[PDB]
Symmetry: C5
Subunit: 25 residues, 5 copies
């Protein structure tokens, strides 16, 4: 399913952005 | 159950990006 | 009403990323 | 339609992330 | 179609975010 891939990649993007925020602060 | 999840995740992404912008500013 | 919100949020993300790019310079 | 706008905005997001990576290097 | 291009661009976004995370730490 192509739609599920987008969601499962966006969750990883959210995790990576949280990591970026924590590394920045 | 898919595009609503996408919208929710993108709202989280926008919040995180705004946090990044305000951290880079100071 | 479904993908219109997606486009709106993508637009916000693009603006925020451009702001980050400018602020890094 | 609006789906093509999502792809265009994602192209710009990739470009802006490339700019961020270049500015971090 | 267009959805498969969105998935490819998200994969690129994940890779670039991994690069940013590695650079930060």
């Amino acid at each position: 399913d192509s739609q599920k891939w987008i969601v499962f990649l966006q969750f990883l993007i959210v995790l990576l952005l949280l990591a970026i925020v924590f590394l920045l602060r």
